[PDB]
Amino acid sequence: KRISNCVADYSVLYNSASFSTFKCYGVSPTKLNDLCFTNVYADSFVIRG
Amino acid sequence: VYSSANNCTFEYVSQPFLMDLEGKQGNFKNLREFVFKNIDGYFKIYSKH
Numbered sequence A: 001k002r003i004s005n006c007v008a009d010y011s012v013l014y015n016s017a018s019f020s021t022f023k024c025y026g027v028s029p030t031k032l033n034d035l036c037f038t039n040v041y042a043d044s045f046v047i048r049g
Numbered sequence B: 001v002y003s004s005a006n007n008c009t010f011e012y013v014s015q016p017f018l019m020d021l022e023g024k025q026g027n028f029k030n031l032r033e034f035v036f037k038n039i040d041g042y043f044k045i046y047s048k049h
């Protein structure tokens, strides 16, 4: 999946207080929203614990 | 119009538009023009009724 012609804040995708784990390298989690990119690829699948 | 679509990208939904599905044989009453361009991979649509 890829998003274009759209706009988003990932803050709502963070304040759910339900995700068990979270990992993001390359950019700080709190200063990625103001930084602007071109396209975002979403890669969803299942895996064991 | 098609059978199935493979892995793909760029799905966009525009504003809703109403039409009449009844076809007649009379004279025309409207004129619609469309211009489609492709510069540096960027799609352009120009129209006016």
Ligand SMILES: *[C@@H]1O[C@H](CO)[C@@H](O)[C@H](O)[C@H]1NC(C)=O
Binding pocket: B006, B007, B008, B009
């Ligand atoms: C997924 O889509 C990309 C283009 O958006 C394509 O290059 C790739 O081959 C696709 N993957 C599969 C498994 O078809």
